[PDB]
Design a protein around this ligand. Structure first.
Ligand SMILES: [Ca+2]
Ligand SMILES: [Zn+2]
Lengths: 77, 232, 351
């Protein structure tokens, strides 16, 4: 929410930890793992009826928007 | 997500459970697709956006089951497609662009017949019948002329591909009106109905004296384009 | 056999890598403009004029008796030769629309009047096709043949989207070769008939064809399932032994390894073939001439004109046949600023 960078965060965390005796800012890997729930593609659900010509999975995250183009340079690239 | 209401189990014409308070400030605007393309070239935009259209069309009927608060519950959906620029409005609607003669997006009168009477029109446009009119265009079952069919079918020339309720963009809604009052005053300084043709600079001289007039009383510097501030 | 660079006068944002050229009665017409028809031309078809290297495009009009054609991208062109009943026609089907939906609807184009001032009026009639219909596809090939003496048409090749069984919204823009069945089209009426042959192992696409005297030859192209571009020239011979169009074909030894070629007919059955791409990485650079007769294909390698260093070193390109030894090649130019006219055009001429 304040656009802070990542190595930024770890340096800041080193600072606050070493400074005053307490663990105030949660470290990196636990941060990412705790965050991973909030992105799309985490929570199992169901659909009645099943959708038309749509995949059955629910875990897939960021799909490449190319949408599976045959890279063959004969067609429009 | 604009609003979630309740339905169980009688008439429930409306029981708002959560109606979003600040639906404009971007802190409620979730992005879902991004492409390094331009707004103009219909080609790549359709080519990528297609899948999302298929999801739209496949979702509106079937119903969803989600485990929330320990309870597995059902969910239905509508869709109100508004967030498009007028250019994109008619582009997704397939209609001509942009300074055409079929100015409206819900009535089908042209420029002039809308100029005759202003406040007497009924809303007709909807995605389905625009699809229908395009089909009539394509088959052309009456061997009509170019312009004759163009008029009879109400300027439908390209198969639209995303149902959007063509609602007014509240944002500008004034800039045309602002410059219209500007023109009213520019033709009020110069007595118009006695002299039906102001000259090249007479119009500009009238705008100049009007500008220093409103600089005298309301103190507004000469502006080029009627953005929000000056218009308000 | 030489190139001359041209200059794009105007309307430079109306040509795209996929397009076609209908050459007929002098004035030749470009079909397949990018984007939906603009108001400057509700037809979309343009008439192309060349004057001291200047490439101008005028907005051809329509008839009144005519239906209106969306700007299809890569249909199968077939010059329906001038004869009974109404000379002379161009068969177009079916390509894919600017919105990625395919036509699966045959179209036929003809000329009506002129000028009075050089103006060549046109008409575009849909001919409904019943069957046993050909499936919607793109990049395939259509041609005309005449058997004792009745005239029919032949369709073959082409890829398509996954049928609406596993057409999934993450593979929603993938393609697969259509099942290789040639289709036989009667123009009157469109009682299309499907046919097969155990020699039609698997259907390839982008393969320019050549028909003559009720015998056709299919040249090199590109197939995906094996990812190879095989060099097996194909011939087929049909006979309209009514009420059966009974067919056979034959493999040949040598077929060139070329895709998306620029075919200019010079003589009776003399075709100078430029060839677009040798393999999926290296463009085809040189030229080719093919004669044909009952003997068969007579290959030859003519003089390749020295392409300029820029076109020599560009990755890809395209073009069309200006007809009669003349042709147009277009190269996507990379440079700042994008004018947006980022396309260079060379007029190539044989002899
Ligand atoms: Ca805009
Ligand atoms: Zn209206």
């Amino acid at each position: 929410n304040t656009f802070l960078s990542c190595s930024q965060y770890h340096k800041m965390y080193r600072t606050v930890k070493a400074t005053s005796g307490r663990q105030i800012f949660q470290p990196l890997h636990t941060l990412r793992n705790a965050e991973k729930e909030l992105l799309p593609g985490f929570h199992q659900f169901e659909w009645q009826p099943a959708l038309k010509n749509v995949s059955t999975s629910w875990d897939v995250g960021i799909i490449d928007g190319l949408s599976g183009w045959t890279v063959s340079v004969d067609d429009v690239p | 997500i604009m609003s979630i209401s309740i339905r169980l189990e009688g008439e429930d014409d409306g029981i708002t459970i959560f109606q979003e308070q600040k639906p404009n400030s971007e802190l409620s605007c979730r992005p879902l697709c991004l492409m390094f393309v331009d707004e103009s070239d219909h080609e790549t935009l359709t080519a990528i956006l297609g899948p999302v259209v298929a999801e739209r069309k496949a979702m509106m009927e079937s119903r969803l089951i989600i485990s929330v608060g320990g309870l597995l519950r059902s969910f239905r959906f509508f869709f109100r497609g508004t967030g498009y620029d007028e250019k994109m409005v008619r582009e997704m609607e397939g209609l001509e662009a942009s300074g055409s003669t079929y100015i409206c997006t819900l009535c089908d009168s042209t420029r002039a017949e809308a100029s005759q009477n202003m406040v007497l029109h009924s809303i007709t446009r909807s995605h389905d019948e625009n699809l229908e009119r395009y089909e009539i265009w394509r088959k052309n079952p009456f061997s009509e002329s170019a312009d004759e069919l163009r008029d009879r079918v109400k300027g439908v020339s390209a198969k639209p591909f995303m149902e959007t309720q063509p609602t007014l963009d509240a944002l500008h809604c004034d800039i045309g009106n602002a410059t219209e009052f500007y023109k009213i005053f520019q033709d009020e300084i110069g007595e118009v109905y006695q002299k039906p043709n102001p000259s090249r600079e007479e119009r500009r001289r009238w705008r100049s004296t009007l500008d220093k007039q409103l600089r005298k009383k309301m103190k507004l510097k000469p502006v080029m384009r009627m953005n929000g501030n000056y218009a308000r | 056999m030489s190139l001359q660079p041209l200059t794009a006068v105007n309307c430079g944002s109306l040509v795209q890598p996929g397009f076609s050229l209908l050459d007929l009665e002098g004035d030749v017409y470009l079909f397949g403009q990018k984007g939906w028809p603009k108001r400057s031309c509700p037809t979309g078809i343009f008439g192309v004029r060349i004057k001291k290297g200047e490439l101008k495009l005028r907005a051809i009009s329509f008839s009144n008796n005519s239906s209106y054609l969306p700007p299809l991208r890569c249909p199968a062109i077939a010059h329906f030769e001038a004869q009974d009943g109404k000379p002379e026609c161009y068969l177009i089907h079916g390509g894919r629309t600017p919105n990625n939906e395919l036509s699966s609807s045959l179209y036929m184009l003809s000329v009506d009047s002129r000028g009075c001032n050089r103006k060549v009026t046109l008409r575009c009639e849909e001919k409904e096709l019943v069957g046993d219909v050909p499936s919607a596809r793109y990049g395939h090939t259509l041609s005309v043949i005449n058997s004792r003496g009745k005239t029919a048409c032949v369709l073959f090749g082409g890829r398509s989207y996954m049928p609406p069984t596993e057409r999934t919204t993450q593979n929603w823009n993938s393609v697969v070769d259509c099942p290789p069945q040639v289709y036989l089209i009667d123009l009157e009426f469109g009682c299309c008939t499907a046919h097969t042959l155990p020699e039609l192992t698997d259907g390839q696409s982008f393969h320019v064809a050549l028909a003559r005297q009720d015998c056709v030859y299919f040249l090199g192209g590109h197939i995906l399932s094996s990812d190879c571009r095989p060099s097996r020239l194909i011939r087929l011979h049909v006979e309209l032994l009514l009420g059966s169009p009974v067919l056979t074909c034959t493999i040949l030894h040598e077929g060139l390894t070329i895709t998306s070629a620029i075919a200019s007919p010079i003589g009776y059955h003399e075709y100078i073939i430029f060839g677009g791409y040798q393999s999926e990485t290296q463009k085809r650079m040189e030229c080719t001439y093919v004669g044909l007769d009952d003997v068969g294909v007579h290959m030859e390698s003519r003089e390749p004109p020295q392409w300029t260093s820029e076109i020599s070193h560009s990755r890809t390109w395209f073009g069309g046949s200006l007809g009669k030894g003349t042709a147009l090649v277009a190269i996507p130019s990379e440079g700042n600023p994008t004018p947006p006219e980022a396309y260079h055009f060379y007029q190539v001429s044989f002899q």
